[PDB]
């Protein structure tokens, strides 16, 4: 029965948000993160931004069995235990999910603890908004006085036109594909570590993003899988209650950045220090 698989899965322990955080502030640690498209990807399929590439899915494979240490905190949804604190649709896509994927999970996942993937999801799947904003100070002092250099899409936009960043000393954007990043994948690790010396690294950039942090990891910097961080923090910023399409940027779960207006912010220009693609 499936109600027994739930049961057995809840073996699986991962460190909620707050948890997470002080993790890797403690540890000053890289984060990778394993959402529903990384497994999807791993098992052969091709996600939204993504294509299926086999050398994709073998390294993230080889990244997940990596174990979590003060240098990289490897995460998994937070979805094992504790399922009521998501809405219902979220509830049903995730049960859905780790259903179908059990034998995955059972099997490859026996880590004694994982972070959270959803560092970067910490408002509107949420049935209580009420610890939100404590999750996001606590992500803010990751950035606070930090000299950051953003590895994201010509999509992302992060932090732009929001406070987000407000408080880091400096931003550098290396501004990836917004599709299908992992065929530059080269260039992108190595015009990050050319231009990462005395930075912290975010990136925001799908499966390609995890390859990059464990690559960057074994090279000794802190870089950091934030992910969609931008959209809920938006959702945040104006009490969203449902995933409002964002205009001027892409949106998290709207699956192929239709409908974009975007505009020219000369700050955001001069942050960029190349684009790739
Ligand atoms: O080839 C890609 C794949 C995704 N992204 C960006 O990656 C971010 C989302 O990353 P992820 O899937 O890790 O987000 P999560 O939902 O896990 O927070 C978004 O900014 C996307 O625009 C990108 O720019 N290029
Ligand atoms: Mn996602």
């Known amino acids: 029965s499936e109600f027994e698989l739930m049961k057995r899965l809840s ?3 991962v460190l909620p948000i707050l948890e997470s955080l002080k993790y890797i502030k403690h540890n ?11 497994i999807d990807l791993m098992t052969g399929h091709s996600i939204p931004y993504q294509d299926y590439n086999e050398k994709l ?13 003060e240098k990289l905190l490897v995460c998994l949804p937070d979805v094992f235990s504790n399922m ?31 972070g959270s993937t959803f560092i970067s999801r910490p408002y509107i ?8 904003e404590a999750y996001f100070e606590s992500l803010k002092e990751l950035w606070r006085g930090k000299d950051l250099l953003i590895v994201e899409g010509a999509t992302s936009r992060s932090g732009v036109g929001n406070d987000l960043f407000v408080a880091a000393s400096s931003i550098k954007r290396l501004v990836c594909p917004s599709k299908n990043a992992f065929q530059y994948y080269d260039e992108i690790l190595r015009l990050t570590e050319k231009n990462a010396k005395n930075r912290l690294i975010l990136v925001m950039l799908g499966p390609t993003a995890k390859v990059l942090v464990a690559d960057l990891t074994t090279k000794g910097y802190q ?15 104006m009490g969203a ?13 709207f699956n192929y950045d239709e409908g974009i207006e975007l505009e020219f912010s000369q700050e955001y220009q001069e942050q960029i220090v190349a684009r790739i693609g």
């Open 125 to 132: 799947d949420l049935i209580d908004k009420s610890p939100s």
């Open 223 to 237: 870089a950091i899988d934030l992910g969609h961080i931008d959209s809920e923090y938006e959702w945040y910023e």
């Open 241 to 253: 209650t449902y995933k409002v399409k964002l205009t001027n940027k892409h949106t998290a779960e």
């Open 28 to 38: 000053h640690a890289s984060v990778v993160r394993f959402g529903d498209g990384e």
């Open 57 to 69: 899915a073998k390294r993230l494979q080889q990244i997940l069995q990596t174990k979590s240490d």
């Open 84 to 114: 009521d604190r998501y809405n219902q649709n979220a509830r049903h896509f995730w049960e859905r999910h780790f259903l179908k994927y059990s034998e995955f999970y059972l099997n490859c996942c026996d880590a004694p603890f994982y």
């Open 11 to 13: 073996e699986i322990k």
